[PDB]
Structure formats: C-alpha cells, structure tokens
Design a protein around this ligand. Structure first.
Ligand SMILES: [Mg+2]
Ligand SMILES: [Mg+2]
Ligand SMILES: [Mg+2]
Ligand SMILES: [Mg+2]
Ligand SMILES: [Mg+2]
Ligand SMILES: [Mg+2]
Ligand SMILES: [Mg+2]
Ligand SMILES: [Mg+2]
Ligand SMILES: [Mg+2]
Ligand SMILES: [Mg+2]
Ligand SMILES: [Mg+2]
Ligand SMILES: [Mg+2]
Ligand SMILES: [Mg+2]
Ligand SMILES: [Mg+2]
Ligand SMILES: [Mg+2]
Ligand SMILES: [Mg+2]
Ligand SMILES: [Mg+2]
Ligand SMILES: [Mg+2]
Ligand SMILES: [Mg+2]
Ligand SMILES: [Mg+2]
Ligand SMILES: [Mg+2]
Ligand SMILES: [Mg+2]
Ligand SMILES: [Mg+2]
Ligand SMILES: [Mg+2]
Ligand SMILES: [Mg+2]
Lengths: 113, 206, 152, 243, 124, 51
RNA sequence: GCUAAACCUAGCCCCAAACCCACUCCACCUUACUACCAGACAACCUUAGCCAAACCAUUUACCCAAAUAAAGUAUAGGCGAUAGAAAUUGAAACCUGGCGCAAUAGAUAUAGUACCGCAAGGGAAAGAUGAAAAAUUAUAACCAAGCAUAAUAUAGCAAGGACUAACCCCUAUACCUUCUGCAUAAUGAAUUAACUAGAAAUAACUUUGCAAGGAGAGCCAAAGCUAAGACCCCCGAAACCAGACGAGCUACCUAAGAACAGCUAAAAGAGCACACCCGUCUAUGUAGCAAAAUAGUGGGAAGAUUUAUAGGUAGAGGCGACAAACCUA
RNA sequence: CCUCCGCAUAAGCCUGCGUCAGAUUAAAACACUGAACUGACAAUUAACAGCCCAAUAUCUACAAUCAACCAACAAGUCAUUAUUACCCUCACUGUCAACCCAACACAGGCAUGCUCAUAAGGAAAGGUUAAAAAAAGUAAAAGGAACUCGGCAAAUCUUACCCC
C-alpha cells in the first residue's frame, strides 16, 4: 500500500468524533434525566451464581405473561456455593503465585544489582 | 499496526515491525530473557540528539552523538564510534562493500557531557522553581537544554504545504458550536426541514 | 448501523431514520467474468439490500436497479505452531447493477512508475552498491587465483 | 494458601458487608439470637448432675436435641414442636440383630379455628400437641403471641403473629364502626405486649424477604442533576450577592 | 465425531435449520399465511445524508494548527454555559420562579417529546 | 508421528536498514574515486628530475 | 564424525501478612453466542461404601467449637478388634523466606492444546549461540547406546595361566528368585540417560547434665530424672455404593412417507427370479481391504418385509417371537 | 477393456487437484508436478426447500387399488361455515469440490428419480527371467464317489425311504 497511515488516521479521527458525540449525549442525558448508560438494566444473579449486568431486550407484551422470558431463571439454588468457593480458592491461588513471582523477581533484582 | 508482543520478547535493535525481526526470533522460540536495570521514566536523563562519551571499550575517551535510544533494554548507539565491520550486499557469486555497523551500549557506560568544557559530568534531575523541568549538572551547576531532534512523523512544520485534502487553519479554530439543550439528531433533523407528526407509543424494557 | 440496538417499532410509529451510519463498503474488482452493468461490492455482515440501495443513492447518488448479495465464508484450515486452526474473518459481497443502462469499468491504480526524485538517504546507498558492483566484478581466469591487488 | 476467616463466618461477613448491613438492629439481633427450642421428642434431664447406679459417683448429664425434618406442609400449616424423625430402629429392640430405618409421621386433623384479633376463620390441619398448647394458653391468639419464633416452626404462625402485632400497634379499626366497645375490649385484652410499628414489620420475615423489603424501601428513582445544579447555582449567587 | 471448537453458523443444520439462524441481519417486516414477506417501509433504516455543496472543511488537518489541552466535556460545563446566563438574567431583574423550570429546557418526563434520552428512541 | 524440519534461513544480505526506520548509516568513505588521474605517456622515459 | 550429548527461565509447594474479584458497543437460556408476542408446574429429605475384627450380620477416628497435662481416666463396645470426653491452673499485640527444585524434578500446563466418544469425561513431550544475527564469522574439538574409518581366517558362556608375537597349549556348566536341588528346555531382561522402593510408638542400648530429687506448670521416683543417637519397603486383581450419560449400531413402541422388473398370476402371510433383507458351505488372510472381507452354490422378495426423519423405555434396571441375546468395537 | 456405474435429491466438517512464487528442505509409499503444501488472489447472487397462518362458535359416516363390472377386510393417507378488524408489500439462510461414517486416499456400509447401458466415469501390467511352493480359471485314453466320517470347491441338473 502506498500510504497505510491515512487509514489509521481516519480511523482514530472517527473514533474521536464518536467519543465526542457520546460524551455530549451522556452530558445531555445527565442534564435531562440524570442517569448514566442509556441501556437500562439491573444487577441480577444467573444460575451459575455470577453477579452479571442483565440488559433489557425491550419486548412488546409484559413480563408476567411472556412464555420465553419466564423460562429464563434467575436464582442461584443451594448447589453452586461449592463451585463459587472453589473458584474463589483458585483465584486466591493465582494471586498468591503472582505475588510469589513478584517477590522472587524483586529478590533477583536485589541480588544481581 | 497493533500486534501483541510475547511476554518475554527480546529487543534486538530492529523494530518489532520488520522482516528481519520476524526472521530473528519468530513466535516459536522462548529464549532466556535478559534482565535489565529497572530505570524509571523520571530518572532517564539522556535523550536522542545530545552528544555523549564512551566510558570504556575499543575506543574509550571519544565523543559522539546518539541517533537511536532503546528504553526496554537501555541500549544506546553512538554516531559511528564503537562500531565493527560487516557486509551489506551478499549473493551467491559476489559479495562485498564493507559498511561498519554501530553497536548498542548500556547507560552505565555512557555519561552526558556538557558543551561548556567538553568533559564528562554526572547530570541529575533538579526541578526548577520556574515551572518547567530541565537537566542541571552536579559538580558544575550547569544547565543542558533538550536537543532538538526530528519527531517520528518525518515532516517539519516550518515548510509544510497544505494539499488538496488538507484544510487550512482559520477554519479549524472557528468557534461555531452553540451550547444548548438539544440533541444532535433532532437538531440536524430540524435544520434540514424534516418534520414528523406521529409520536412514539409506550414500550416496555425487561 | 452495526452493533447498535435498534428501537422496537410499534404498529404506527415514526420512521426509523439513521444519521451517522456505521457501515463500511468495499469496492472489490470482480475475479470472474462480469457484464458492464454489474458492479461488485463488499458490505458488512449487518447490511441488507434496501440498506445498500439507500446508502448508494443517498451519498454517492448512484442509480441502483437490483441488488443480489450472498455470504462468503472464509477459509479455516491454516494451522499455526501449536496445532490450532486459524479462523479468517468473513464478509458479504454484493452485485449491484446500474439503472439508466450506464457502463462502468475498474481502472488500474498502478501503471505510473515514472518517479525518480532526489534520493540522499535511500538512492545514495543503491548508487554506491551498484558502483561497487561495477568496479569489483573484474575477475580474470588467466590469473589462476592470485589476488589482483599487488602491482608487482 | 489459607483463608483469613473460617468457613462458618461467611454468613456473618455477608451480613456485615453492605446491602445486608442496612438492616435494622432489632431484626439482626432476632436473626442472630439462635435459641434452642423446647424438648418434644425427648425427656430433658432434671438437674445438671445425675447419680447413676452401679457406681456412687456423680456425673454431669446433658439433653441433646433430635434432628427432626420440617416438610413444607409444616410451614404451610400450624404444627407444634414435632415433625418427621428420620432415625434408625433395631429389630427386636436389641443391638445384636439388624439395624433398620424407621421414619415416624405425626397425626394430622383438619380442623377449623377462629382468630379474635383478625376475625376470620382458617382451615388448618392441626395436630394434638398444638391443640393442647392452645387449650393451655387459653385461646389461639395467646398461643400465637406468647410462643417465640423457635416454637411455631411454621411460616403461617409467624405471619399471624406479625399481623396481630401490626393490628395492635397501628390501632386500625378491626371490625367496623357503630360499636367501638368490642374493639376497645379486644385491644385491652391484648395489652401486655404492644410492639411498636417500626419493629413489628420485621417479625417473621426471612432473609430474602427482608432484602427485598429493604431494596423496595431504598429504591428511589435517580433525581435529575438539573435540580441539584440549579440549587447549587442559586445558592452560590445568593452567597455572592448577600455579602 | 463432529466439530465442537468452531462456532454454530448457518451451514451445519439440515433443511429445518437454514433460516431461523441467519447472520444477525435486522428484520424489516414479518411473514403471512402465503409464504410471503410483508416489508414495512417504517422499519428500514433511512439514511439522512445532508448536502455537501458549500462545505469548506477537509478531512485532514494541516500541521500548522496549534495544539491545546484536552479536557472532557462534562454536564456541569454545558449547564454553566447554557442555562446559567439565562437564570442569572431572570433573577437579577426579579422574575425567577422555582416552581416552573420547563422554559429552560428541563423536561420532567421523557414521554412527551419524540427523541427521548434515557430509553433512547433514536438509533444512532 | 507428526514432526517436520525447522531452521528456515537464507544466505543473502538484502535491504532492511532504510525500510521504515529513523536511523540512517554513518559511513566513513565513498564508492570510487572522484576523478581519474591521467599520468603522462612519457613517464618512464622522463623518470629523472625534470626536462 | 555423523547420529546426537550439558548450557536457565516461564516458574512450580508450603509459611507470615492481607480478607480476593467480576459491563468499552452489540449477542447469551429457542438450534446460548438467535432483536421483536398470550397459561404463569420447577429447591426445602437419615449419605453410602471399602477396610479391620484373619469371615461377617453389632462395631470401625473422618463429625470443621485453637495448644497441653488430666488421659488414652471413668465409660460405650458379638465387654473385642476398637472408640472416647468432661469438671480443673492455664493459651505475650507489630518485622518481606526456604540447610525445596530447575522441563522424565517441581501444578497436568507455553494448556486443560491436539487426540478418543453423540455424550459426561480422559488427556500427554515443547523454549538452550551471542554485548552487538542491523557480527550468517569460522570454528574450539575431545565421553554412552547405532555405523563407516579398519569385515571374516579352525575349537567352542567368549574367561584365566602364560611365552618374542591375535589363534594354536591346559583349565573352567551366564546373572537375581519362589526351590533340598536351576545356565538348565522355569520365571525377568536389547542397550544407553533420567526416576523408582525401610516412613514410626511403649518397652530396650550408649553418652552428657542434675540428684533423693529430676524436669521451662501437668509426669516419674525404696538411685532416680532430662536430653541426644539408634528402627521397622515398593508395585500388581476380580468386587460395592454415591453424583451425573447414553436406544444416531442393536431390542420394543409411536406420527407422517418411500421401495418391490418380469413369468406362472389356482383365491393365497403362492413359486422362480432384478434391485433389495440375512448369511448354510468351499477357497483366500488372521499385524489382512476389513479390531469380521471377497464369487456362487443360498432363504425371502405383495408382506410376521426393508428403509429416510423425529420422540420415549438405563443398571436395586431398560428390552426380550427366552439367545442370561442386546444396552456405542 | 469394464460399466454391479454415473448424474441429482436426503444426511455431513465447510473451501479440501483454479492461478502465482517457493519448488533448496519438508508429506507422493519413485518421478513429472500435485487429491497426503506454505502464503496472496475469489468463487456460490434465486425463481430451488424453508423462514408461515388474527380471533369468537359451528361443520366434515359412503376409502385407495386406471375406479367404471364384480369382489372384499387389516375398516382406511388429504374438504368448511357466520361475524369482527386488516388495501404497508419481495427481506433472510446454502447454491464450490474429487466430499460421509470406520485411527487412513480401506476389496466395508448408506435412503428416492433418471437411460438398467447409454451422451457419466476409470486402467488388472514399472522393467527383466520363468526357480520350487500356494491361490484363481479350461479339459483329459478306462472306471464315474471304488479317496475321504460324511457328495467337501466343481459341472450334470437329480428319484425314493426314516426321524424331528
Ligand atoms: Mg474384614
Ligand atoms: Mg475441657
Ligand atoms: Mg513438566
Ligand atoms: Mg507432565
Ligand atoms: Mg560411542
Ligand atoms: Mg579349548
Ligand atoms: Mg540384585
Ligand atoms: Mg514365582
Ligand atoms: Mg520343584
Ligand atoms: Mg532359561
Ligand atoms: Mg514359575
Ligand atoms: Mg523372554
Ligand atoms: Mg430408534
Ligand atoms: Mg426380535
Ligand atoms: Mg409369497
Ligand atoms: Mg421366493
Ligand atoms: Mg434357554
Ligand atoms: Mg451444486
Ligand atoms: Mg478400521
Ligand atoms: Mg468416458
Ligand atoms: Mg496399474
Ligand atoms: Mg511387478
Ligand atoms: Mg478324465
Ligand atoms: Mg467310501
Ligand atoms: Mg456341493
């Protein structure tokens, strides 16, 4: 390609324009409604016991009579606490091994230098 | 453009985005990394463009200028001083033209020299009370300004000529924004004359 | 626009109008034989026929007659070093045709290699290399193998 | 690695976290009380020390509870301190035979009661011990209001208790006007309790129901920042003008 | 065995699966009882392209443009730039009323006008 | 039973310094000579002091 | 000298401290990686089993409240292999490492990647020059198992005694083990490199220290008490329970379809016979084309026949025109 | 020379003998260069089958087998009415191939239509000599089961008796 930098320049220019218009929209929404993130939702717990942010899909009929939305469960049920504890222990082991690696690197740096 | 580098990639003079770099260490070999001095960004006094001096080596006590700096392994090169010998053009029946190539050096082997007396002198970072941050000497108390080096854009602004697809300057700095309580969509709709009579009914969100 | 949640249209609602679109079409030269009226493009995976017609008649203002698109599946067989398949990004090519019977060909952006400006940081090295090649290539088989440096 | 807190303190940690920490003090105390119930399926020992035969030496004795099971039919109705006992029974009352498993079931009598505080009849599959406790407590309302949460072992009992407490606290007209003397006599008969309104609403609720109620009370739609901005602006202009 | 690591496209299922999968295309209508498509003209995204006749602005900026500091455009700056002068003007004379604020651009609800911000009725 | 041969290299020096870089080469000489000196034809005959 | 041998770093295990996290836009409960439509039913339950008592039917620490002495005391226990407290003096806040290792070790990990089954799941080796590879230089070579350089020369468990010289002269039945007796024609072995197999109490022995007292609370004592040293293997089965998975091959059932030339067609769960369903025999191979094949001689082929699609019946069972046949070789 | 094959539909990962450079090394059971390859170029555009049906009440016993004689039994594969509301319209999934399941480029297996051999498609043989042995094919002066436990491949074309 003769000049590939022009493509990246146009890309970052359009990204900056998108960021500017999004910031303007957010400022106008805060000055009018006063709530961040135009996509509504709430913190709901799924079956896997993970605290995720469920996004609304915007339906026509309400939720108390829908057939497909009622099949979407939102409860942990006492059988995922063990899996959550095991995941927490695994992440704790990961963090401890990372801290041990950092300490070993610091010791090597202090020993050689 | 944006390629993810390995966590233990060896920097060997050549930039990561080159054919020789991909030929040297392809993403398949994980050789022993080289531990370097953990130098911060505020203590890095030597730049690219200022004159330096080789401490020891095959030609100690000589002066020279730096043309490229490396912050990953603290590698600096001198403008045709501590160099060796190699060959550029090499074929299967004829090769020659010996062109010397520079060799990188460490920060412990390079000291900054003041242009007043041309002598090696340790330079510290003394924050001036005027506002800016420059380099002040230690045993001499002298100031060494930042060397003027061309940026990586490869173009100087003292002779730039605006092209066909390049705008001027009196239009990019023209105050045309009017702060109001109107969205961009409705504004560009009412500015072009687009009207709408019907409204939007009630909708749920779940 | 792509990757944007579309508003739910109600029976009798306003017209769905988009201002800042997020579509990137690519004019690709046809590989096989094609007539003079059929033009081949490349639209993203989130674009239909009427959307392409409006995009071509609103910006470029090109009279479009018919649009026939299809999905192209990229290759997936190239293996890396750790024995893993490499997935190629897919795309959707288009085949639009003009309306007023106009003709359109694909010019070349390349036959113009007449450039020889002043080169000091690139052409000088090549000039030195070719001069050395012309001055060194002077072997003599009658010598046998003795160097041609000693004048004695 | 090792944990900082034991595995039996995570419930207390979650209660002391954030959303579960905004609960009132009385509700948290009633939840963390944890008191042993009354012996039903076993006779408790008299004194803490019992003189056993064969050897003239005193030894300390203790009364251990019986792990009983509570089916949802117990939570729906009003049962006593009994339930399902999933234990084991030998053959001919001897340990030198076969160890079989036997599960006892209480007796259910579908009767009909009449609450004086609520003035409404309910059909509850009552047993025998519950009827005995009602007869000893001189009515159903007294049996419901005197027995604590560890004695009903049912959700309907706690709901009835909370309803009676709210009716006695709010002083809401139970029956109807034209005869306030009956309502006055009913309120005077049940005057040895009178739990305040701010504490009677959190009696018998579970953890999930309490969290839901606290979230509904602490809902509050986000107020637009325009009002706060104009308030700060008018305050600043008044401060810069009056000086 | 069959593949597992690859995603589920539209070239894997039999005759009963080609159709309901798709490639994420946005529907602009529905179907009827005669195997026909009822396309609604109010569901297709209409591209609004303004006129580009007298527009003197190139997509590339010249290198002679001076740089400046970068700062986000928060809501407080827009408020103090738009509504603050009008409020100060109407209060300095003696006619401001904290009961009505609909004359400054504030809307108590979003169900009155068309382009709502919190539910976002406009596409992009 | 699935191994191949590695080590893929070439023995030829191509161009790579000036391909998208900001560091040139500081030479110390040139290609050939500036102007070729033409000695006199009677140099061997007049190899004395002067004539 | 070819084959090929070593070059340390991703880090790996446990301590002390600290409580650790989860939306950039879109998609994720139906055929997850799918924008858009009318019955809201879905958790609340003694775990079991192996082993031991030389069997085994009672029994067998595992129960999640900090040490110790009491104390392995009273007790429970086919009163036996074992289990086991309580009452009681009491329990000094804060400091950043390895008398552990370096790719057959240490997490399996560069990774839960390839590969196997529809499925749960199982699951392995990787990377070595250099300050300057923008130094493609000339060197640093030298050691195991396999080879040429440099084949054999009569005789003999490959060995010893020897002489001026390999053979020629004499003697001499490989290695560990269940076994009285093994090279026996019993068991194991092609080599090299890495790895792999004696962990511990009461009572005993020796040597310091103190002493009718010893011992850093508790215990012992008619020469005792404290401390130290010294000591007791590895691998290899059929069986049982608990939590999840399978009728896409095969057994049965259900709903909608398809298949069967021609002749004799006696009206037919008729005959010969294409395609088709199964395979009685010969010959070929058993590391083959194939972890069940090749041609005919074979029975049926208008019906108790075969088949494309979708669903259901699964182990204390499913199914069964009953072979203890089948339930992914 | 074979065609006991091929072309489409049904099921199936989806780019798997088109071009270019490398073809020094690497996979062809050896070579050319290519069905056991590295990177770049783009194929397939629907009309084919799907993506389906606004409700309230009500209606549907005289098969198919040329369906016209006759004849049945296993008693059977197809249909509407009254009312209310609705005149915006052509979007989406694939159209390549020498291909699937068996660890494979396997003498194994796969549902329907088309001429049941043709207009589809491929090569039992690398060369040299004719060792022994083995396997697959034609027949033989006289006997035609006298060899073998038994008619065990084979071709003639084959009757009667007994048990179940
Ligand atoms: Mg035993
Ligand atoms: Mg105690
Ligand atoms: Mg390892
Ligand atoms: Mg391993
Ligand atoms: Mg050797
Ligand atoms: Mg001898
Ligand atoms: Mg041994
Ligand atoms: Mg043995
Ligand atoms: Mg023996
Ligand atoms: Mg032997
Ligand atoms: Mg033996
Ligand atoms: Mg052997
Ligand atoms: Mg089946
Ligand atoms: Mg059967
Ligand atoms: Mg028949
Ligand atoms: Mg037949
Ligand atoms: Mg039988
Ligand atoms: Mg086709
Ligand atoms: Mg096979
Ligand atoms: Mg042909
Ligand atoms: Mg051949
Ligand atoms: Mg041959
Ligand atoms: Mg004969
Ligand atoms: Mg005979
Ligand atoms: Mg025969």
């Amino acid at each position: 390609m003769p000049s590939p930098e022009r493509l990246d320049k146009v890309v970052d220019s359009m990204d900056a324009l998108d960021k500017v218009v999004q910031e303007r929209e957010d400022a106008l929404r805060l000055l009018q409604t006063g709530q961040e993130r135009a996509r509504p939702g709430a913190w709901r717990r799924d079956i896997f016991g993970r605290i995720i942010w469920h996004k609304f899909k915007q339906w026509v009929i309400p939720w108390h009579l829908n057939k497909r939305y009622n099949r979407k469960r939102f409860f942990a049920l006492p059988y995922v606490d063990h899996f959550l504890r095991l995941e927490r222990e695994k992440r704790a082991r990961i963090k401890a091994r990372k801290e041990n690696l950092e300490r070993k690197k610091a010791k090597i740096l202090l020993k050689k230098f | 453009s944006k390629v993810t580098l390995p966590p233990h990639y060896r920097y060997g003079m050549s930039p990561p985005g080159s054919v020789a770099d991909k030929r040297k260490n392809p993403p398949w070999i994980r050789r022993r990394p080289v531990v370097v001095e953990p130098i911060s960004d505020e203590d890095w006094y030597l730049f690219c463009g200022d004159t330096v001096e080789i401490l020891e080596g095959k030609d100690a006590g000589k002066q020279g200028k730096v043309v490229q700096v490396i912050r990953q392994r603290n590698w600096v090169v001198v403008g045709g001083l501590n160099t060796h010998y190699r060959y550029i053009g090499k074929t299967m029946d004829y090769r020659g033209t010996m062109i010397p190539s520079e060799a990188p050096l460490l920060h412990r082997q390079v000291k900054l020299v003041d242009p007043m007396d041309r002598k090696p002198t340790e330079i510290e970072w003394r924050f001036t009370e005027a506002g800016e941050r420059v380099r002040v000497s230690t045993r001499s108390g002298r100031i060494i300004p930042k060397p003027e080096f061309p940026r990586a854009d490869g173009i100087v602004p003292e002779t730039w000529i605006d092209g066909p697809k390049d705008t001027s300057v009196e239009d990019a700095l023209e105050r045309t924004y009017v702060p109001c309580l109107k969205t961009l969509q409705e504004e560009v709709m009412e500015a072009m004359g687009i009207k709408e009579t019907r409204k939007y009914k009630k909708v749920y969100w779940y | 626009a792509r990757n944007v949640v579309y508003p739910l249209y109600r029976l009798g609602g306003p017209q769905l109008r988009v201002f800042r679109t997020n579509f990137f079409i690519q004019l690709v030269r046809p590989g096989v034989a094609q007539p003079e009226d059929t033009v081949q493009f490349r639209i993203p995976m989130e674009m239909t026929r009427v959307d392409l017609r409006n995009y071509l008649e609103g910006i470029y203002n090109v009279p479009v007659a018919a649009v026939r698109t299809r999905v192209q599946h990229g290759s997936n067989k190239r293996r890396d070093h750790r024995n893993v398949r490499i997935k190629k990004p897919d795309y959707k090519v288009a085949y639009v045709q003009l309306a007023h019977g106009q003709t359109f060909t694909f010019p070349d952006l390349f036959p113009e290699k007449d450039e020889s400006p002043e080169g000091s940081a690139a052409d000088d090295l090549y000039s030195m290399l070719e001069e050395e090649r012309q001055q060194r290539q002077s072997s003599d088989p009658r010598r046998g193998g003795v160097p041609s440096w000693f004048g004695l | 690695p090792l944990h900082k807190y034991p595995v039996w303190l995570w419930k207390r940690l979650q209660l002391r976290e954030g959303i579960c920490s905004r609960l009132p003090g009385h509700y948290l105390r009633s939840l963390e009380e944890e008191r042993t119930p009354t012996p039903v399926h076993y006779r408790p020992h008299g004194a803490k020390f019992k003189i056993n035969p064969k050897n003239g030496q005193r030894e300390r004795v203790e009364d251990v509870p019986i792990p009983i099971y509570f089916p949802p039919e117990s939570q729906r109705g009003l049962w006593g301190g009994e339930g399902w006992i999933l234990g084991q029974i030998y053959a001919n009352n001897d340990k030198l035979s076969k160890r079989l498993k036997k599960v006892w079931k209480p007796q259910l009598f579908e009767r009909e009661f009449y609450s004086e505080i609520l003035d409404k009849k309910f059909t509850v599959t009552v047993t025998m011990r519950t009827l005995d406790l009602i007869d000893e407590a001189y009515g159903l309302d007294f049996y419901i209001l005197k027995a604590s949460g560890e004695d009903l072992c049912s959700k309907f009992g706690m709901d009835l208790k909370r309803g009676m407490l709210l009716r006695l606290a709010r002083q809401d007209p139970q029956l109807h006007p034209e005869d306030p003397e009956r309502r006055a006599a009913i309120y005077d008969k049940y005057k040895e309790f009178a739990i305040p309104e701010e504490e009677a609403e959190w009696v018998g609720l579970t953890l999930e129901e309490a969290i839901e109620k606290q979230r509904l009370l602490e809902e509050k739609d986000p107020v637009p920042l325009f009002k706060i901005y104009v308030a700060e602006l008018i305050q600043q202009l008044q401060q810069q003008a009056l000086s | 065995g069959a593949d597992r690591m690859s995603k589920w496209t539209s070239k894997r299922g039999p005759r009963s699966f080609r159709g309901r999968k798709g490639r994420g295309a946005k529907g602009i209508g529905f179907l009827t009882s005669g195997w026909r498509f009822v396309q609604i003209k109010e569901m297709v995204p209409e591209f609004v392209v303004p006129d580009l006749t007298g527009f003197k602005l190139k997509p590339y900026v010249s290198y002679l443009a001076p740089e400046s500091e970068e700062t986000p455009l928060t809501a407080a700056q827009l408020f103090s730039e738009a509504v603050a002068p009008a409020i100060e003007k109407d209060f300095k004379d003696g006619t401001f009323d904290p009961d009505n604020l609909e004359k400054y651009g504030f809307e108590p609800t979003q169900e009155g006008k068309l382009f709502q911000l919190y539910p976002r009725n406009f596409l992009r | 039973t699935e191994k191949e041969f590695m080590q893929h290299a070439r023995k030829a020096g191509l161009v790579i310094p000036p391909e998208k870089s900001d560091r040139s080469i500081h030479l110390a000489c040139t290609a050939g000579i500036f102007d070729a000196y033409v000695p006199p034809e009677g140099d061997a005959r007049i190899s004395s002091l002067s004539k």
